Design an enzyme around this catalytic site. Structure first.
Site, PDB file in Angstrom:
ATOM      1  N   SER A   1      41.256 -22.838  -4.616  1.00 42.20           N
ATOM      2  CA  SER A   1      41.750 -23.454  -5.666  1.00 42.20           C
ATOM      3  C   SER A   1      42.862 -22.609  -6.578  1.00 42.20           C
ATOM      4  O   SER A   1      43.528 -23.230  -7.574  1.00 42.20           O
ATOM      5  CB  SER A   1      40.681 -24.053  -6.483  1.00 42.20           C
ATOM      6  OG  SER A   1      40.068 -25.174  -6.014  1.00 42.20           O
TER       7      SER A   1
ATOM      8  N   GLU B   1      43.721 -31.176  -0.964  1.00 42.79           N
ATOM      9  CA  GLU B   1      42.526 -31.040  -1.131  1.00 42.79           C
ATOM     10  C   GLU B   1      41.635 -32.254  -0.452  1.00 42.79           C
ATOM     11  O   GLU B   1      42.125 -33.385  -0.278  1.00 42.79           O
ATOM     12  CB  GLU B   1      41.893 -31.044  -2.653  1.00 42.79           C
ATOM     13  CG  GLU B   1      42.466 -30.065  -3.753  1.00 42.79           C
ATOM     14  CD  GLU B   1      41.261 -28.910  -3.742  1.00 42.79           C
ATOM     15  OE1 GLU B   1      40.227 -29.171  -4.426  1.00 42.79           O
ATOM     16  OE2 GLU B   1      41.576 -27.832  -3.134  1.00 42.79           O
TER      17      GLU B   1
END
Ligand code: NH4
Ligand code: NH4
Length: 262
Positions: free
Chosen positions: A42, A140
């Site tokens: 991330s 994602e």
């Protein structure tokens, strides 16, 4: 020899560790495996917010984005409570950085637009900052260690953060938004923040994944206000796809860096 001490951390945690601290007006660079590739996880969400800021007037932060429960992808602490109302671009930037919100990231990528759901455009933003090595390919998956997709290097991402937070890549008003979101991050208490004394200021963005991946990228300020960029990345490819990420390794590496910088 600091490199000896980084290697001891690798053996104790059965991990591979990467570190880069750019040289400054009074310090040499710190580097350990700094040009080896590590997964973003991330950590890309910080420069992703910068890319959206760069490309738009600040009025864009008030733009309301609507989405559905089927758009919730990746771990999404904020977005999954706001399906009915939607979220503004500015709220999505906040969530993507401070809560690593995967849906927010996906929507910000879609806001850049273009092939790959915005991932090509994001990679191009990094190219514009002089980053010739990093790449983002997917939204994602526990990518295998050998796969170069969705990777950066400690060297590359540190110099990206250097330009964004301490350089002139962004005008001061956009720079201040990025800095504030990273400063109030909620996911990083046990990583670089845990390695620096309490009177140092720490802003950061984390990443975590399979194969024991744990990252943190930070800007820190000494108690007299001198800033340094600190990028720490780690994985444990030999422990299998479900190897445990180790926040303590990042905290201990950051402690070694703080000993050099204090
Ligand atoms: N990756
Ligand atoms: N996307």
């Amino acid at each position: 020899d600091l490199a000896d001490r980084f290697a001891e951390l690798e053996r104790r945690y059965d991990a591979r560790l990467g570190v880069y601290v750019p040289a400054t007006g009074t310090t040499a660079a710190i580097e350990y495996r700094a040009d080896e590739r590590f997964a973003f996880c991330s950590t890309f969400k910080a420069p992703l917010v910068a890319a959206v800021l760069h490309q738009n007037p600040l009025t864009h932060l008030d733009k309301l984005i609507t989405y559905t429960s089927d758009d919730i992808r990746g771990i999404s602490p904020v977005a999954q409570q706001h399906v009915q109302t939607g979220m503004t671009i500015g709220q999505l930037c906040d969530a993507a950085i401070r809560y690593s919100d995967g849906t927010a990231a996906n929507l910000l990528l879609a806001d850049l637009g273009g092939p790959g759901g915005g991932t090509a455009a994001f990679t191009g933003y990094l190219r514009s900052l002089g980053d010739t090595v990093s790449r983002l390919d997917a939204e994602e998956n526990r990518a295998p260690p050998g796969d170069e997709r969705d990777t950066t290097t400690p060297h590359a991402i540190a110099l990206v953060l250097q330009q964004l937070v301490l350089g002139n890549a962004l005008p001061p008003d956009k720079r201040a938004l990025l800095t504030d979101w990273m400063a109030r991050n909620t996911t990083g208490a046990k990583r670089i923040r845990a390695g620096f004394p309490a009177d140092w200021k720490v802003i950061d963005k984390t990443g975590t994944g399979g194969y024991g991946r744990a990252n943190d990228i930070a800007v820190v300020w000494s108690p007299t206000g001198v800033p340094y960029v600190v990028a720490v990345m780690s994985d444990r490819a030999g422990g299998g796809y479900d190897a445990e990420p180790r926040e303590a390794l990042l905290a201990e590496a950051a402690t070694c860096v703080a000993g050099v910088l204090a």
